[PDB]
Amino acid sequence: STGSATTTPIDSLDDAYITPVQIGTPAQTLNLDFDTGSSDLWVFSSETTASEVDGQTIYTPSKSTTAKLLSGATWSISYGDGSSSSGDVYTDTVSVGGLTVTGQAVESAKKVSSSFTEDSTIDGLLGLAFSTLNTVSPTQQKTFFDNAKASLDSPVFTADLGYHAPGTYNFGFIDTTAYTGSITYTAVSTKQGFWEWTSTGYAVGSGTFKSTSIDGIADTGTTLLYLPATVVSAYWAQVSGAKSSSSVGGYVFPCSATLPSFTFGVGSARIVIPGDYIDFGPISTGSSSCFGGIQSSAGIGINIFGDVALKAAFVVFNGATTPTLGFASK
Hints:
By secondary structure, the chain is mainly beta. Helices cover 6% and strands 44% of the residues. It folds into two domains: 5-174, Cathepsin D, subunit A, domain 1, CATH 2.40.70; 175-330, Acid Proteases (Cathepsin D, subunit A, domain 1), CATH 2.40.70.10. A hairpin with a 6-residue loop joins strand 9 (156-160) and strand 10. The longest helix has 8 residues, at 229-236. This is Endothiapepsin. It is an enzyme of class 3 (hydrolase).
């Protein structure tokens, strides 16, 4: 089997992407944030504290003839950005882009933190990291991909995120029309539960390529590109007036600037992030200070190849017995 679904930016800055997902019988369609950095499929629901729902579409398990309470199961998750959610668990039928999993764990939120409430466009998350990170207790549950894998034509999914435009998540096949040149594959460590890999280096604008190993994670659920302070300083040094602002929480730059591109290495291959992908707009409405899309990972404890990086590529998440990652230009 295969599936193919369009993923759409939630706003004009590409802060996140939402993909429609069918849950239950009859289908209830919710727009979920596909997150290769986590491993829980959780939704706003009829069980979510009323004051914490503000415009989201909810899953109502009592209206699904295929929903079953997973007795005794609870979940609770905290994300890198400080947000969190928790609740109980149902199993139900879940379909993405025509690909159907029966008996998928659907984690129903009883509580969500303010950032979730305040984002009316995201109805929940669909985790696509390794199932070892799933938070369900006392019986850990499998991700949608893990459940689908054996049925797929090939044990893969691909992320093709757009810049200020829709893109695609495919399951079970590689669309050879969706990229240019070849796909370069690179090794993955699953030791921390992530799609963790090692970039071979970087360049800033038309500058020379610096060969250096950068371990990090391919994370569709993180907006920005978080890299070591040395790398980030080298980038922003090429933008007149750019500076790190403790009050704002990262590098800012004059909105009048033209940003240089940023290149990262995948083996001997190179992925070029255009300068415009690195512009996240005014820090506050009407400001002429703009927020940068490349930020330091210092104090995160890990480098993160988030949407800023991934949207410059066609990305293969290869879930074969030994997983790997593939990157192509597009």
